[PDB]
Design a protein around this ligand. Structure first.
Ligand SMILES: COc1ccc(CN2CCc3c(c(C(=O)NCc4ccccc4)nn3CCO)C2)c2ccccc12
Length: 62
């Protein structure tokens, strides 16, 4: 699905060593710009072992 593609692309992104050295807020804005919902972003951060609350992600994006 296009959803799973979005989340998979986010995971690959978040795993990058440079990206790991980038702040969460930056990453979150970036992912929204690529069309991901807050929920999809939250999924991705948990999948990579850097879990964030949906609440924190929505706050970044608010
Ligand atoms: C917000 O921080 C960044 C954004 C983009 C970049 C540039 N790329 C970083 C590595 C990268 C990117 C992308 C990427 O833009 N993929 C497209 C995509 C599509 C939908 C959701 C997420 C990513 N994927 N990867 C991993 C495999 O190359 C984008 C950054 C690079 C270093 C540090 C921070 C970056």
């Amino acid at each position: 699905s296009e959803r799973e593609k979005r989340v998979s692309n986010a995971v690959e992104f978040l795993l990058d060593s440079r990206v790991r050295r980038t702040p969460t807020s930056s990453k979150v804005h970036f992912l929204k710009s690529k069309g991901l919902s807050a929920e999809e972003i939250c999924e991705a951060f948990t999948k990579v072992g850097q879990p964030k609350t949906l609440n924190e992600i929505k706050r970044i994006l608010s």
